[PDB]
């Protein structure tokens, strides 16, 4: 969710994935296919939903942590400088990236644990399976 301590601010830019593996920590995983900002509350909205579906196992890996502070409008003005260090924290995701990947539970019993998680995401994803063997 929210980081523990840091610097305080940032900026904005994009270009395709870079460190989003594939299989690892599980057999089934969910992959993001579009450039976006993933709100930390948009992850909970995913995890939590996923939990419910899984009556146990917790074999859910969320490997897209919010390494980013965004700001906002103190109400209107414009005559002041940097604003709202605290609007919210997001975690820039890029295509091919892997935010989710369950483990242990049946295909179907997974093709749903994701589907749902998809429904609260600002981007389109697609489920991936195996044959992932680069580095280890």
């Amino acid at each position: 969710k929210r980081t523990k301590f840091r610097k305080q601010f940032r900026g904005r830019m994009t270009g395709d994935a870079k460190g989003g593996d594939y299989v690892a920590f599980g057999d089934y995983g969910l992959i993001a296919m579009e450039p976006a900002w993933i709100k930390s509350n948009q992850i909970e909205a995913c995890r939590i939903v996923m939990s419910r579906h899984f009556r146990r196992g917790g074999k859910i890996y969320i490997r897209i942590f919010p390494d980013k502070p965004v700001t906002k409008k103190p109400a209107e003005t414009r005559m002041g400088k940097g604003k709202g260090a605290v609007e919210y924290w997001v975690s820039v995701v890029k295509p091919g990236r892997v935010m989710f990947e369950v483990a242990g539970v049946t295909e179907e019993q997974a093709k749903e644990a994701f589907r749902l998680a998809g429904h609260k995401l600002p981007i389109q994803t697609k489920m991936v399976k195996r044959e992932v063997y680069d580095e280890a």
């Binding site: 994935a17 146990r56 196992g57 280890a136």
Partner: protein
């Protein structure tokens, strides 16, 4: 896998379903360019622990091994491949996947067993006889049973490159 071409220029393939790999050892690192589909259907099985027929256009069957494959992001599709020609008595080192069999005594119990490390690497495989898999006992494993390299029975010869006390699978607790 009848790969025929092998030039720096791939216009004649990029449009036409054809992957593009390279092979070697220390002698010949013949430029290459095999067929999409084929490799695609191929590597699935033999994976990286499977040497296959490489008769390049002209007919010169060669023995190699799937070393490293780098596929496209966004599109699960593969783009490049490295074939490290087989050997005879020694290749280098190989990547062999860990597998389970028989219900574990932790599953029905109250928790689920987890495989801390999917594919495992052992020192010195042994060209001609390199484990195209690795089934492992899990049953015994209860509520916190971690198995390691110092456990897994190896195929007469093969030595474990992975540090021993390293957990390959444990049976994770419930919830």
């Amino acid at each position: 896998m009848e790969l025929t071409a092998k030039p720096r220029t791939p216009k004649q393939k990029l449009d036409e379903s054809m992957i593009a790999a390279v092979a070697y050892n220390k002698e010949n690192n013949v430029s290459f360019a095999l067929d999409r589909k084929a490799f695609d259907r191929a590597f699935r099985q033999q994976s990286t622990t499977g040497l296959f027929d490489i008769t390049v256009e002209g007919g010169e069957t060669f023995p190699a091994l799937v070393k490293a494959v780098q596929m496209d992001k966004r599109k699960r599709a593969p783009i490049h491949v490295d074939f490290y020609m087989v050997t005879y008595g020694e290749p280098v080192e190989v990547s062999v996947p860990v597998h389970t069999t028989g219900r574990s005594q932790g599953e029905v119990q109250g928790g689920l067993v987890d495989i801390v490390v999917h594919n495992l690497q052992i020192v010195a495989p042994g060209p001609r006889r390199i484990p195209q898999e690795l089934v492992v006992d899990v049953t015994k494993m209860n509520i916190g049973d971690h198995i390691t390299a110092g456990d897994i029975k190896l195929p007469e010869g093969c030595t474990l490159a992975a540090d021993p006390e390293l957990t390959v699978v444990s049976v994770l607790p419930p919830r």
